[PDB]
């Protein structure tokens, strides 16, 4: 299918602080298999995770997010 089946989920970060872990969390994507890319907005104090249903599931990626040590909540 030509259309992009890939899906992206945004979660509100409650652990974010004055620090700049955003850059560190970005590298995590390099370890992610299914996930395509992760975009974090410090201005919105939120975290966006882009993944594909053909590779990894949404619920599965949820557990990985916790691996960052921070707490994320469904923004949708």
Swiss-Prot record:
This is Copper-transporting ATPase 2. Monomer. Interacts with COMMD1/MURR1. Interacts with DCTN4, in a copper-dependent manner. Interacts with ATOX1. Interacts (via C-terminus) with ZBTB16/PLZF. Most abundant in liver and kidney and also found in brain. Isoform 2 is expressed in brain but not in liver. The cleaved form WND/140 kDa is found in liver cell lines and other tissues. Residues 7-73 form the HMA domain. Changing residue 34 to V: In WD; uncertain significance. Isoform 1 may be proteolytically cleaved at the N-terminus to produce the WND/140 kDa form. Copper ion transmembrane transporter involved in the export of copper out of the cells. It is involved in copper homeostasis in the liver, where it ensures the efflux of copper from hepatocytes into the bile in response to copper overload. It is found in: Golgi apparatus, trans-Golgi network membrane; Late endosome. Each HMA domain can bind a copper ion, they are tightly packed and closely interact with each other. Wild-type ATP7B can usually be loaded with an average 5.5 copper atoms per molecule. Belongs to the cation transport ATPase (P-type) (TC 3.A.3) family. Type IB subfamily. Cu(+) 2 binds at residues 18, 21. It is linked to Wilson disease: An autosomal recessive disorder of copper metabolism in which copper cannot be incorporated into ceruloplasmin in liver, and cannot be excreted from the liver into the bile. Copper accumulates in the liver and subsequently in the brain and kidney. The disease is characterized by neurologic manifestations and signs of cirrhosis. It comes from Homo sapiens (Human). It comes from the Eukaryota. The chain holds residues 141 to 212 of 1465 of the full protein.
